[PDB]
Design a protein around this ligand. Sequence first.
Ligand SMILES: [Cl-]
Ligand SMILES: [Cl-]
Length: 154
Amino acid sequence: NISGKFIQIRQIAGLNSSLKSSGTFKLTNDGSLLWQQQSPIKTTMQMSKNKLTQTIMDNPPTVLTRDDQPIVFTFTSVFMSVFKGDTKTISEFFNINFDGNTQNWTITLTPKSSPLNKAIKEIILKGNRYITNIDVADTQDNIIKIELFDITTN
Ligand SMILES: [Cl-]
Ligand SMILES: [Cl-]
């Protein structure tokens, strides 16, 4: 399995500040992702084969739907897929451009068709042995930038 820390900055074009959050993540080879936001409010996202849930503080988790939360479903799918080397699944829904080498690469993803291309403009991933940066731009001039660090394999 693979685990590390994240810092997340959300820039919505109409807001007068950026929204910052941070926490940890844990991936296992059996396709589970645990995304634990620790600041500024505790929240947890859990992905497994057939399910994505989100938990806010100590409230009951809710099951997310791809039709209501397309960007979260897309982000977690792409995140998992790149850690696993599963470019086949990515290429079903995205155009892929790879630039660089094993020590420094950038992957640019643009959606191939509707309805994904109504939600996402581009996803940019950068990294080395592991992903270090993920940026998600929606079609409304909003950007979410994530940095991954202190990554270890266990
Ligand atoms: Cl192929
Ligand atoms: Cl090169």
